[PDB]
Write a protein that binds this ligand. Sequence first.
Ligand SMILES: C/C=C\C/C=C\C/C=C/C/C=C/CCCC(=O)O[C@H](COC(=O)CCCCCCCCCCCCC)COP(=O)(O)O[C@H]1[C@H](O)[C@@H](O)[C@H](OP(=O)(O)O)[C@@H](O)[C@H]1O
Ligand SMILES: CC(C)CCC[C@@H](C)[C@H]1CC[C@H]2[C@@H]3CC=C4C[C@@H](OC(=O)CCC(=O)O)CC[C@]4(C)[C@H]3CC[C@]12C
Ligand SMILES: CC(C)CCC[C@@H](C)[C@H]1CC[C@H]2[C@@H]3CC=C4C[C@@H](OC(=O)CCC(=O)O)CC[C@]4(C)[C@H]3CC[C@]12C
Ligand SMILES: N#Cc1ccc2[nH]cc(CCCCN3CCN(c4ccc5oc(C(N)=O)cc5c4)CC3)c2c1
Lengths: 235, 57, 286, 336
Amino acid sequence: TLSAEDKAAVERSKMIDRNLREDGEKAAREVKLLLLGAGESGKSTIVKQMKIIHEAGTRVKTTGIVETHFTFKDLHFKMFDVGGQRSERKKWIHCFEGVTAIIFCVALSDYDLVLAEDEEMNRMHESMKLFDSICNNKWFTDTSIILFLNKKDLFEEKIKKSPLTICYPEYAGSNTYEEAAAYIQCQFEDLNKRKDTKEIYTHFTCATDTKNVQFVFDAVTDVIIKNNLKDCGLF
Amino acid sequence: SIAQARKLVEQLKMEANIDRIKVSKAAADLMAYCEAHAKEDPLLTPVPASENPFREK
Amino acid sequence: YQVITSLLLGTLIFCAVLGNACVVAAIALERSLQNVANYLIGSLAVTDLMVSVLVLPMAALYQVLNKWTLGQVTCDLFIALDVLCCTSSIWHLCAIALDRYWAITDPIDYVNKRTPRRAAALISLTWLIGFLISIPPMLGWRTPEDRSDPDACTISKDHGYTIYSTFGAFYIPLLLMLVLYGRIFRAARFRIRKKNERNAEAKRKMALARERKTVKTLGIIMGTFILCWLPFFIVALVLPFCESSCHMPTLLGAIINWLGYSNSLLNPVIYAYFNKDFQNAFKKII
Amino acid sequence: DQLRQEAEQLKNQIRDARKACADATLSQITNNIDPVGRIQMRTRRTLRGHLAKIYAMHWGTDSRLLVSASQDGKLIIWDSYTTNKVHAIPLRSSWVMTCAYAPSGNYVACGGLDNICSIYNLKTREGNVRVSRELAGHTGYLSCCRFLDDNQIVTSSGDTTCALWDIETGQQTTTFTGHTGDVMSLSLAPDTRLFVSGACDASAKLWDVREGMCRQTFTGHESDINAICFFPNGNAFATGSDDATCRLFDLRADQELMTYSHDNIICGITSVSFSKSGRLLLAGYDDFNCNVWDALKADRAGVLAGHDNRVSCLGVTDDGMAVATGSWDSFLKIWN
Ligand SMILES: C/C=C\C/C=C\C/C=C/C/C=C/CCCC(=O)O[C@H](COC(=O)CCCCCCCCCCCCC)COP(=O)(O)O[C@H]1[C@H](O)[C@@H](O)[C@H](OP(=O)(O)O)[C@@H](O)[C@H]1O
Ligand SMILES: CC(C)CCC[C@@H](C)[C@H]1CC[C@H]2[C@@H]3CC=C4C[C@@H](OC(=O)CCC(=O)O)CC[C@]4(C)[C@H]3CC[C@]12C
Ligand SMILES: CC(C)CCC[C@@H](C)[C@H]1CC[C@H]2[C@@H]3CC=C4C[C@@H](OC(=O)CCC(=O)O)CC[C@]4(C)[C@H]3CC[C@]12C
Ligand SMILES: N#Cc1ccc2[nH]cc(CCCCN3CCN(c4ccc5oc(C(N)=O)cc5c4)CC3)c2c1
């Protein structure tokens, strides 16, 4: 009670609590994004582009989860890459509940290619199944998804050479970059079961340095504004 | 995937050579251990507040 | 016949106190409801509780007895508490509107520089405006007509004080709230507006539903504020200037006087008893 | 090849031997034991300070100090007697889903989505906690870790293997392989010669620390196992799974004894622990409730309601005075 040791213990507890509160306030000022996608789906390219101008604002190599810390327009972003996590997603996907948005990356040029596990499995079909699984989890019901369609030029060359009917037999239209890209985009967007709660922002990755991060910033600001409107009761 | 089959069958044949006892004896041993230390379990029998560290000093 | 009036007033104070106290308790005992918006809503609930505990009983006694039987000093205390607490309730409404406007129109400020110190500053400014409106009639600047009739507790009817108090307590807040909520409405509409045919039809229907909801909610807020407080301030701005030829009917005058206090009862319903988080917290407490 | 035929033959032989060794169920033996009765526990301490979901906790051997891990990248050493934060260790990676307290009370460990088990030195010359060593080598998320001694630590990860580490050197002394799914839980025997691990392949295995081989295999569940804990005797253990069913397995009998299930619960178990005498089996559930089970009767004796989101971790002191449950609402609660 009044002993010196008890006073010292209470003082240390109060100091630690103040430090914890300060760290929590500092961490609450950060926007968290989850990066997903197939293996060779252009994930690293998007990470490099986002960190080209802004990076980080005897440790052992982790390779489990990779954090990218970049700031744009006075807004702090954190991206978590779980590509190297080879295990069941069901056991740790709930750790990312509460992220502002999910950055899903899929390559347009792998529709012709097939997985190495078996020949009769399209890579784009694997990406679609992953998108369906991650867009309808019980944890990400309120979380918006930012969809990036990488490798537009390779896809254009491939559809110039090879037709799109192999990946989508039901498809019936002219083989052109615009129409095929629109078809792929709408096919990915039709997997969103929670139409009323979440929204999908689709962008085609471009060689310009700042356009992709600008699109991400616009999507995050739109998500924040719509969440505020919902809290206020006007949305 | 045939090399792992040999390891699996070796593990199975190794797991089947252990001595086993009757379930009645094991249940009796568990019950005896439970009843022997029942007096020393503060959770089973609520402790008086005089010597309860988490309520009163 | 006075028994009916007494029981109606008593149940009015009882409901107001119960609602405001429930809102304050729910905010206090829940960790989930501890953000800036709920802090402002809780301060508004506390102000309404002060109106219902410190002002409504004396006003109800005045209504029932149809005369003031408590004293001149008690009359001054009642007037000061009445002007201070009710002006505060209005400026809490304006502060909530301002916070919503800042959150909706400035996401960067919402993420970075939005801290509970902002809520504390807004509450302090509201109470400071309340004091600036309530104090000066006490420190002079009051006509002797207030003390001329001992069997009455009317607010000072000086033209300058009437203009000052009415403007700074209802009319400046009204314009501020109208401008802020108009900007908020424009922002909401801009956000909403911005087989393939089935998806397009579904999106159009969803946009129409959201537009109807963002019209209804804004209408509820603004209409409640207007229909609660506007008639009394129109009366208080018109009658003092026109001393004669503007007799006020007793029943209509009493209804106009007592309409303003219903805002302190309807405020928790609109700002607290509607959002989902408060309902979940109340269900958990129940 | 044709080895599947002899494999299934050996499986049938093992099942036949287990059925032959089973004569009377545990329910029949303990029919004459009087019921434990209703167990009423009231919250005694509420430990506050975490700002995110809590995934693990562990009690010290002195039964006064406990450690908790949460998503805010903090590892807090509490003082359960006075609710005083003794330490607050900032983690390099905020994705942590396990923690352990050394038996000597000198070290504390944690691990998570990053595949590294970090060892923190508590008692140092300057009084400031510093990273003693980082243990790398797993290829999946680290699910559990237990200090076998002041120098040896055993870890279980999501790469379907468990490993024994030497903290002084930092290399894997022994690797335990054989699981066909992610290993989610681990518990050490009181004599620290064997340990059991429950994995996502709906099976639990008994390992020998020195030999590094799977001694026995237990398969009763229908879904992945999220928790495990030895009986205080050291000859039995209890597992919790997403099937919403806790089971008691016996090492000597090499089979299943009791099933703890109720029709009103359909949510999986996240944590399992025993009382000091072994009569009470406490389990945490996904419906933010904790149920106290009669280990010898399979009848509920109480409910430790009071949490909000989900009870994720649970533990019982060595002296048995108190039970601490941590949940996703960022609160530790001491029950007693
Ligand atoms: C002619 C054409 C068109 C016009 C005709 C018809 C249509 C319109 C008519 C006019 C409208 C009248 C009132 C409608 C109210 C109504 O619909 O209420 C909805 C249903 O809630 C309940 O049922 C829950 C109710 C709980 C009530 C409180 C319980 C306690 C009361 C006593 C308290 C004191 C004693 C304890 C809830 O609200 P809502 O759907 O109206 O919409 C919003 C609300 O307006 C926003 O304020 C709120 O934001 P907040 O400011 O943070 O709260 C939003 O979250 C959202 O709820
Ligand atoms: C203190 C006394 C006055 C009791 C409180 C009454 C209020 C709760 C009333 C007064 C005016 C009403 C509003 C008058 C008109 C409308 C528009 C109405 O809009 C529609 O759905 C269709 C018409 C349109 O497009 O405006 C929705 C209800 C609302 C906001 C009403 C909600 C309830 C209000 C705020
Ligand atoms: C927000 C919802 C719940 C509606 C709120 C309604 C109130 C504004 C009502 C409820 C009881 C009403 C009172 C009930 C009875 C009387 C007495 C009545 O007596 C008179 O002086 C009339 C003339 C006479 O008979 O001499 C004057 C109105 C008044 C104060 C009423 C004023 C308006 C009150 C406060
Ligand atoms: N002007 C102004 C002005 C300016 C700026 C302001 N800010 C805040 C206010 C306060 C607004 C409400 C004032 N109260 C007093 C009048 N009312 C009342 C109640 C019972 C009654 O009973 C009798 C009877 N029995 O005769 C008569 C009578 C009258 C109830 C409402 C204000 C006012």
